[PDB]
Write a protein that binds this ligand. Sequence first.
Ligand code: TO2
Ligand code: CU
Ligand code: CU
Ligand code: CU
Ligand code: CU
Ligand code: CU
Ligand code: CU
Ligand code: CU
Ligand code: CU
Ligand code: CU
Ligand code: CU
Ligand code: CU
Ligand code: CU
Ligand code: CU
Ligand code: CU
Ligand code: CU
Ligand code: CU
Lengths: 273, 282, 267
Amino acid sequence: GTTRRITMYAEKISDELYGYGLAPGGATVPGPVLEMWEGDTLEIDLVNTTDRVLSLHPHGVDYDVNSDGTLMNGSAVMPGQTRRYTWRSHVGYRRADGSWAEGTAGYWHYHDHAMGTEHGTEGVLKGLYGALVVRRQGDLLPKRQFTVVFNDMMINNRAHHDAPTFEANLGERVEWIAIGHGSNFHTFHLHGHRWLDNRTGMRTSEYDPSPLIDIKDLNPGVSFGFQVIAGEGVGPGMWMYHCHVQNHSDMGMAGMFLVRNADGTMPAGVHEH
Amino acid sequence: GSHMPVRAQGTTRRITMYAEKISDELYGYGLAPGGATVPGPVLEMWEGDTLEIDLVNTTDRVLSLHPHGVDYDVNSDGTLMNGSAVMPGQTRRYTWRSHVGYRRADGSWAEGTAGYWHYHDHAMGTEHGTEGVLKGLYGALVVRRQGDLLPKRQFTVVFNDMMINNRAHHDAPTFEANLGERVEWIAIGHGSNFHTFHLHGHRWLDNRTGMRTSEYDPSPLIDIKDLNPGVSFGFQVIAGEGVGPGMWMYHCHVQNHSDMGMAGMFLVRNADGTMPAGVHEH
Amino acid sequence: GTTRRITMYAEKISDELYGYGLAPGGATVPGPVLEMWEGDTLEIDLVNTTDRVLSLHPHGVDYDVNSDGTLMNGSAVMPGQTRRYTWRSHVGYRRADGSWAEGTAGYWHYHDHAMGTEHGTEGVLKGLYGALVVRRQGDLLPKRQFTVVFNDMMINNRAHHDAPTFEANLGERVEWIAIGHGSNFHTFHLHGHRWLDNRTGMRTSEYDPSPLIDIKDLNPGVSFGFQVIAGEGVGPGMWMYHCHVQNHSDMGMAGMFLVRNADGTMP
Ligand SMILES: COc1ccc([C@@H](O)[C@H](CO)Oc2ccccc2OC)cc1OC
Ligand SMILES: [Cu+2]
Ligand SMILES: [Cu+2]
Ligand SMILES: [Cu+2]
Ligand SMILES: [Cu+2]
Ligand SMILES: [Cu+2]
Ligand SMILES: [Cu+2]
Ligand SMILES: [Cu+2]
Ligand SMILES: [Cu+2]
Ligand SMILES: [Cu+2]
Ligand SMILES: [Cu+2]
Ligand SMILES: [Cu+2]
Ligand SMILES: [Cu+2]
Ligand SMILES: [Cu+2]
Ligand SMILES: [Cu+2]
Ligand SMILES: [Cu+2]
Ligand SMILES: [Cu+2]
């Protein structure tokens, strides 16, 4: 594995919006997608530019308490200060007792654990969250990568209805990372596409039992990911993704997966400005 | 006869579905005029098959038909947004394809369509068919892979908000089998509420079919599963296996939901088809 | 296959709490962990020491209707009465149709089905529940075993922002049995630890596709379990477990998994 070091900025975007970024003034909601290969180490300097206590906490990666991102463990960041966080990962290895310790690979995420409560409630509400992708050697890689976060009644903290439009060309390999947050329950559904329900979303071997699905529970704290071939067997056009909970979709958690023609030209019913 | 097809192809089935108002509270799909049910027909295919459906809208409302899991283009997706809905009194033609697994030019495997899927209205009352679904336009869509074992009995259980198959006066459906029969359950959640489907005295592997695929299958054995809006799954069991005949409750396990009436009976009769102690027939 | 006979006592522990115990005055919430290997049978005399109608009901195990612990099936226990419940179990076997009947093994649970409502709503609420672990031959056994029940807004009926502290020493094999109950949805999450999402939470062949997870839905009626090695690759300390539903955690569904030093001391 390799050791990588990055600086991450926590910034107030607006009254309602706090976010993480890889450069000063570049914070986004959702935050940047962080990638590691199993066994890599990532070291992050979290620069808190805000007037709030806040922090950084991951899922799935190896971290000790001093990296856990909680006030309880002395791991948060005071306003105008920087904290070093250290995330490790490992390949699968055999234990002395005969058993198998699984490698770190999976679709994970990170987010504030310190802002407004010990559980980071206000931090998450206002957008400090981001995808953490830990790859196993040999995993297939995407042309396009989308992070979808159902945060309470919001998709990626967008306004009443502006749900992100995610875009691909017909036939491209597309990676969806999906993360739930907040106090609300959701079900993530994508029209016209489907994946196997397992780590990568695709068949690993003839013995793989996993069912094919077009929809999956996305609850607070939960993350998964998968890959599809854009418009495979269905063609291009505007493909809806949304929360299948009926009053939720009506309140606007619905958005478009836009699949253009292979050459990148717009499909039938679309009006370009 | 020679010559047969150069490459094996699936079957193309053509059907008509009537969307009808049943009462002020109820809308449904049916295979014949006056034949609407809630839930509607179980539609069944094998991987590779095509299903060409004429939806005849007999109501005064805009509504549609949209599936999960099968292959459809935007013109079949069942949304107003894609010009895919059906205006009052009109007929729209929908096409649903399916495929066997295949190897991609990139070397990865495209999974075949098989699984327990479902269909339902996307156009009525909202771009999401909230009213359609609330009022009963939904049904199971079962796509099978070759060699799948076939049920003797088949039950569609839809948790739609606080109702099972929209049964709102006590009267959650009793499902029946004779002891030893292979029985198939298809579970579909709908609406705004969260559920856990639980079945007394029976259990299944949590995977596509509910049974062991090979000696490598890791899937836990379960008697209960989340069934939330949009979610379907299915499994098979041998009725009363290792347990015996009787009234076997199935219910949502959310406490306040079961207490409100989301519970029903799985009635396992004796092998010969006779009532077990406690149950009378008439 | 082994047959085992035990007495179970339903007791009122306090005003807000009912429990099961293996001895008089010994009732706890959650109740005792019942352990079986596939093929074994567990025969239970439930002694009802309360003034309330109540019952005992298993998941996963083979039981006839006479043992399903519901009023509708004549299976409940009146105040003062003693009732026999019989749970059998089996190893996998091949059916005549070629298909495979799965053995019982799993992380299961048992609870009241008769108190307050035909669904045992009051009995579940006031704490009558426990873990039922059915093991398959060759399964690895824990050094420590924790039952966590998310019951409405409570963790093991701690209603006071008192959620249990579960303890282990660094490096010990730890089993978690997770059970949901009540009317709320939850997600169970464990800091600094992860497990394969499958029956045992660990890998049995290179073919197991199961994702590795640190969090899972735990809703009413639902159970599951896994083993971890305490503090593996992460060191000892106060490691949070909690419900990831934000308003829930803020309201007190959070507790500690305390990993001590290899020698038992605090970190
Ligand atoms: C069938 O009769 C009913 C009985 C009870 C209720 C609810 O009040 C609740 C279950 O949802 O009962 C509880 C009972 C005991 C303790 C707590 C409880 O809830 C918090 C609804 C019923 O019909 C709809
Ligand atoms: Cu946490
Ligand atoms: Cu939602
Ligand atoms: Cu859909
Ligand atoms: Cu988290
Ligand atoms: Cu214009
Ligand atoms: Cu939709
Ligand atoms: Cu009515
Ligand atoms: Cu329910
Ligand atoms: Cu049960
Ligand atoms: Cu749907
Ligand atoms: Cu008569
Ligand atoms: Cu029950
Ligand atoms: Cu109290
Ligand atoms: Cu919770
Ligand atoms: Cu965490
Ligand atoms: Cu139960």
